[PDB]
Amino acid sequence: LPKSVDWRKKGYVTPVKNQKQCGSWAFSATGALEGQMFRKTGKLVSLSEQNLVDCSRPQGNQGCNGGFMARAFQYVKENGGLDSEESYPYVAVDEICKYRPENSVAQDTGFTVVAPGKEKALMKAVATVGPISVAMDAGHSSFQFYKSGIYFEPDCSSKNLDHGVLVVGYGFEGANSDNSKYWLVKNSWGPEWGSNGYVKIAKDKNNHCGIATAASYPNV
């Protein structure tokens, strides 16, 4: 596999968004789907997280109260599509479903799940598919106030995961391709968080914060 990957350099990734006061997995799903749609059509179109939060309750999601990227991919599949950010703007509160087929700009036929706990299988998925939806243990001030560098938090769990984000690459700092490795992750806390909205998380350090425990990607 490549020693480094960065899907942003290829045009697969939209700018960093802000979920604001809503606990909305929706941004991780829309990011993985923006990725696949691009691989497929050559166009980068920002998708609607609000569409996911308002309409995916039948699939088992709970809007601002939480959910699962995989259930979001399921909603897209059952719904036959998902609207653009532009046509169904984000308001960060639970509202009535207002999906419009005429405005759908993406689709998936279901999704794929990355082998649990496997960092090599996740590296494979990011090298061959594009940006991947993952869950992580984000509940520590070290991460909440992360600013730069390779994130490592000794108390990070690889089991109790509370935050859905997006892996858009991997790489290594310094000279050794196998030294100081990291996962390149896009957050949804706006550009002012971390390093322009992005965080590097320790890679191949025993599934740090659980990035490889519950990864998935939509099939388009």
């Binding site: 606990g23 088992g60 509940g139 968080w193």
Partner: protein, 152 residues
């Protein structure tokens, strides 16, 4: 109907039909002494205001308080005049009945000790505000607001 140990907890808004919604979600978040308590995600603008000390008493009722270095007061979940959608204020700590939700180990309904009035009053959420919700008392519960207490 459960025994939550005294300690420090983060309280996630959930529901009786969906006690574990997945990743993300919202948490009881303090925004100032005597100000309504809010439901907010575990993100930077809010993360440090989501820890609460829970403490049970002889009647089997608990208080839910906030402590934060230099809070000038000792405040927690509070009520005075309870009415539908009245906000939960961060006032003088009141007592609540924490009833374990069945098929769960850490999900609780937060009730106002008010059953001899004939109605059920529980802490819920309207928008991004914790509020008091009224429910007719019957013989089957059924979608009620609840709270996952996770021990810090």
């Amino acid at each position: 109907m459960a025994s939550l140990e005294d300690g420090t907890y983060r309280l996630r808004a959930v529901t009786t039909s969906n006690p574990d919604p997945g990743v993300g979600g919202e948490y009881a978040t303090v925004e100032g002494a005597r100000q309504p308590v809010k439901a907010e995600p575990s993100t930077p603008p809010f993360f440090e205001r989501q820890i609460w000390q829970v403490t049970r008493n002889s009647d089997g009722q608990s208080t839910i308080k906030y402590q934060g270095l230099n809070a000038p007061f000792e405040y927690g979940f509070s009520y005075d005049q309870m009415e539908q959608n009245a906000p939960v204020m961060a006032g003088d700590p009141k007592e609540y009945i924490l009833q374990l939700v069945p098929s769960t180990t850490d999900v609780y309904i937060i009730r106002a000790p008010i059953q001899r009035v004939g109605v059920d009053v529980e802490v819920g959420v309207q928008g991004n505000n914790l509020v008091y919700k009224f429910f007719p008392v019957d013989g089957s519960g059924g979608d009620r607001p609840a709270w996952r207490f996770t021990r810090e």
